[PDB]
Design a protein around this motif. Structure first.
Motif, PDB file in Angstrom:
ATOM      1  N   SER A 289      -8.662  -5.671 -22.564  1.00 15.40           N
ATOM      2  CA  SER A 289      -8.953  -5.002 -21.309  1.00 15.40           C
ATOM      3  C   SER A 289      -9.180  -5.954 -20.143  1.00 15.40           C
ATOM      4  CB  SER A 289     -10.178  -4.092 -21.504  1.00 15.40           C
ATOM      5  OG  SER A 289     -11.319  -4.873 -21.875  1.00 15.40           O
ATOM      6  N   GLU A 290      -9.615  -7.173 -20.483  1.00 10.45           N
ATOM      7  CA  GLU A 290      -9.918  -8.154 -19.431  1.00 10.45           C
ATOM      8  C   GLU A 290      -9.249  -9.490 -19.690  1.00 10.45           C
ATOM      9  OE1 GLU A 290     -14.180  -8.047 -18.518  1.00 10.45           O
ATOM     10  OE2 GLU A 290     -14.016  -5.963 -17.805  1.00 10.45           O
ATOM     11  N   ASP A 291      -8.172  -9.442 -20.474  1.00 13.26           N
ATOM     12  CA  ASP A 291      -7.410 -10.613 -20.863  1.00 13.26           C
ATOM     13  C   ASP A 291      -6.325 -10.934 -19.867  1.00 13.26           C
ATOM     14  OD1 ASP A 291      -5.917 -12.594 -22.207  1.00 13.26           O
ATOM     15  OD2 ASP A 291      -6.017 -11.603 -24.170  1.00 13.26           O
ATOM     16  N   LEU A 292      -6.506 -12.013 -19.119  1.00 13.82           N
ATOM     17  CA  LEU A 292      -5.578 -12.386 -18.065  1.00 13.82           C
ATOM     18  C   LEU A 292      -4.343 -13.113 -18.570  1.00 13.82           C
ATOM     19  CD1 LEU A 292      -8.035 -13.375 -15.192  1.00 13.82           C
ATOM     20  CD2 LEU A 292      -6.370 -11.527 -15.165  1.00 13.82           C
ATOM     21  N   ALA A 310      -4.162  -7.505 -19.549  1.00 10.32           N
ATOM     22  CA  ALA A 310      -5.136  -6.574 -19.013  1.00 10.32           C
ATOM     23  C   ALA A 310      -4.444  -5.458 -18.236  1.00 10.32           C
ATOM     24  CB  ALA A 310      -6.180  -7.256 -18.127  1.00 10.32           C
TER      25      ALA A 310
ATOM     26  N   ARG B  72     -14.064  -3.895 -12.798  1.00 12.20           N
ATOM     27  CA  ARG B  72     -13.129  -4.588 -13.685  1.00 12.20           C
ATOM     28  C   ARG B  72     -11.992  -5.222 -12.892  1.00 12.20           C
ATOM     29  NH1 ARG B  72     -11.684  -1.637 -18.973  1.00 12.20           N
ATOM     30  NH2 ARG B  72     -13.522  -2.795 -19.680  1.00 12.20           N
ATOM     31  N   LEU B  76     -10.959  -9.254 -12.492  1.00 10.52           N
ATOM     32  CA  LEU B  76      -9.616  -9.715 -12.781  1.00 10.52           C
ATOM     33  C   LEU B  76      -8.882 -10.233 -11.558  1.00 10.52           C
ATOM     34  CD1 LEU B  76      -8.706  -6.794 -15.221  1.00 10.52           C
ATOM     35  CD2 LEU B  76      -9.254  -9.125 -15.837  1.00 10.52           C
ATOM     36  N   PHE B  82      -3.792  -7.928  -9.740  1.00  7.27           N
ATOM     37  CA  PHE B  82      -3.703  -7.089 -10.922  1.00  7.27           C
ATOM     38  C   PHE B  82      -2.340  -6.436 -11.022  1.00  7.27           C
ATOM     39  CE2 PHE B  82      -5.214  -2.969 -12.946  1.00  7.27           C
ATOM     40  CZ  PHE B  82      -5.536  -3.513 -14.188  1.00  7.27           C
TER      41      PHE B  82
END
Ligand SMILES: CNc1nc2c(CCNC[C@]34C[C@H]5C[C@H](C[C@H](C5)C3)C4)c3nc(N)[nH]c(=O)c3cc2[nH]1
Ligand SMILES: CNc1nc2c(CCNC[C@]34C[C@H]5C[C@H](C[C@H](C5)C3)C4)c3nc(N)[nH]c(=O)c3cc2[nH]1
Ligand SMILES: [Zn+2]
Ligand SMILES: [Zn+2]
Lengths: 363, 363
Positions: A289-292, A310, B72, B76, B82
């Motif tokens: 979910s927060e993996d770049l 993410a 979130r 990110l 994003f």
């Protein structure tokens, strides 16, 4: 370019790398062919499919004859013009649906109401303007008793002869397309031999190994490939139908297979599975979910150059079409990169080391 | 580039064409902003959206705060990073959902459990890194009695002041983003005036006409625009929220509107409606099954350069993702081409003739 020419440029063991030259382009082997049911590689424009490195895509008689119809596609200019892919197209014959699906079967063919027979299948493939035509066969179900496997296989060989004759009787098809025969025999060595003998006696441009990836598992599939591929003419391409996971492909190449098709990179992609050199991941899992990082650390595809796990995690969980687009582009690119690494390693004589390295890391 | 500058290059009647300069790029006006709920313009890559000619896209506080979450997205890197769109982004405030959706309302804000208030909405837009921030308002339902419209409008104006103060209290936001106020008042001239007066007294970078395209129909919408837009400061952009069909846009520009957002080109596209200069078509209709022409005869988009109505007809009927991709790209391109024609015709002093020509053909 000729109608059809296969040339082998390098070998390592049973593995081969080379090219198939056809009027619409060259195919580098071992090759992976992205697939589709409805005149599209799902969620990708043709230009995107080509950018991943595919040289050829696969379509299918059964689905296109139902929608939009083979005659309709011919009236509109054929499949290549219709869908906007101008490179070779291989079409399956409907023989896997003879198993996977609704029918009444007889020596004449199979009724689904819609009928398919050797003659009708080859005609449909003509109407689509397929470059590589598959003979109309029966994918024998698994498990099968020897008796049933033999009877099935014998029918397929009779259908193979009918397929060859139908193809040859249409001069435009015979002059511009190629015809592949399909070996059956289930898991039984003597039936596989009988089938290979029948097919080579008829004579084809290429030879598919049919009747596998039908639930027997990898170990059994490999055992069968071990004796079945050397039964096929060495100087023609060997196509393993419906395979498979990256490790299936590597092992099959080790056993002499040149061509592959599978729904996995497309389907799995839309379901959230991404292929990586460290094995598959399910991008929906909360750990992403927060993996770049990109899907895969080394992949050269456009998706890994620009978007994070993410973001794609979010897209798939939200049911967004772009999620399917991105996952599919990545997985097809991954598969094409696998094939390139396989071709390069065979041409450099280091394929067994690659296969080893590949498996240690993937698993 | 400055934080925000609007300059008007040409006028015809109440119509204007010009540019908004912001740190992340220039916006040509009158402008159409493609929209999305989930950090994507549905079925399009950002590069595709930009290729159609969009200068700016729209996101929304309400949906992004639910998924994937505003905090979130900030962790990110913000919305631009994003989703991979580096040009300006406008975000709506959640005020339309105050109407369209589940709630408890009070002078403090609205609970949906999730809460939104002027302060929280502006904070979320900050976390997303929106370039154009919308004040938190109430879209008054239609029809409304004068009493109810007034009470609603007055609350919105108090919320508008709170929105301005929240925005100004965050220096990074105030130095790099723009804030737009939203006029309410339903269909009543005196309430619209009171609202415009309140908003200009607070002072904003731009002014939206809210509370329309909520079921009153085009004739009533135009009647209200007739008196409402001249109430807004002339030297700032005028944004009509949630509008609309191509003919709505042309008429609204004729009444002084500079900016538009609407789900129609995207949503309608995925449902099979294509916009054409000869009016909209539903590509699923059987009349298109063998039609080799592109969606529209004059459109410059990539879809009309390559694929036929027949193919796209097939894709939509088959439920294929590529069908939605192609329809959406075309419809967004169409909308962008409409805006270009509007800008060119105003700069050349022939917009009234264009509007006339446009309507005769479209209808
Ligand atoms: C999965 N294992 C497997 N597949 C097999 C296929 C189909 C190949 N893929 C084409 C196909 C099949 C479906 C799914 C997609 C699109 C379209 C419909 C064409 C690929 C097979 N096809 C034929 N004619 N004969 C086989 O023995 C056979 C055995 C298979 N074993
Ligand atoms: C349709 N007519 C209409 N819309 C309106 C909107 C939303 C604009 N579009 C953004 C939006 C709204 C939905 C649908 C998509 C994506 C996301 C969620 C953001 C566009 C409105 N927004 C605000 N804050 N205030 C209004 O008065 C208003 C009136 C509208 N009248
Ligand atoms: Zn990748
Ligand atoms: Zn177009």
């Amino acid at each position: 370019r000729p109608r059809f020419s296969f040339s082998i440029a390098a070998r390592e063991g049973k593995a081969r790398t080379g090219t198939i030259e056809m009027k619409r382009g060259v195919i580098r082997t071992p090759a992976f062919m992205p697939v589709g049911t409805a005149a599209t590689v799902k969620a990708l424009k043709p230009e995107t499919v080509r950018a991943t490195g595919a040289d050829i895509i696969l379509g299918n008689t059964y689905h296109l004859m139902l929608r939009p119809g083979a005659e309709r596609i011919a009236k509109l200019g054929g499949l290549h013009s219709f869908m906007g892919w101008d490179r070779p197209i291989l079409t399956d014959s409907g023989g896997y649906q003879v198993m996977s699906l609704l029918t009444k079967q007889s020596e004449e063919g199979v009724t689904f109401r819609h009928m398919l027979s050797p003659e009708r299948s080859i005609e449909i493939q003509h109407l689509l303007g397929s470059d590589i035509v598959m003979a109309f066969d029966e994918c024998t179900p698994y498990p099968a008793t020897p008796s049933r496997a033999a009877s099935s296989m014998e029918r397929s060989m009779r259908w193979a002869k009918r397929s060859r004759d139908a193809f040859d009787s249409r001069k435009e098809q015979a002059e511009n397309a190629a015809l592949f025969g399909i070996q059956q025999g289930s898991v039984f060595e003597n039936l596989r031999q009988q089938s290979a003998d029948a097919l080579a006696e008829i004579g084809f441009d290429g030879y598919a190994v049919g009747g596998l990836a039908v639930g027997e598992g990898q170990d059994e599939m490999f055992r069968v490939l071990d004796f079945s591929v050397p039964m096929l003419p060495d100087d023609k391409p060997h196509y393993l139908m419906g395979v498979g996971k990256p490790d299936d492909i590597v092992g099959a190449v080790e056993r002499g297979i040149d061509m592959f098709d599978c729904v996995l990179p497309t389907r799995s992609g839309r379901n959230g599975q991404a292929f990586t050199w460290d094995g598959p991941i399910n991008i929906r899992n909360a750990r992403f979910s927060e993996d770049l990082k990109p899907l895969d650390s080394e992949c050269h595809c456009a998706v890994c150059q620009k978007w994070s796990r993410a973001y794609i995690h979010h897209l798939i969980r939200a049911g967004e079409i772009l999620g399917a687009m991105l996952m599919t582009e990545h997985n097809i690119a991954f598969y094409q990169q696998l094939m390139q690494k396989i071709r390069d390693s065979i041409s450099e004589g280091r394929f067994s080391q690659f296969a080893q390295d590949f498996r240690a890391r993937y698993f």
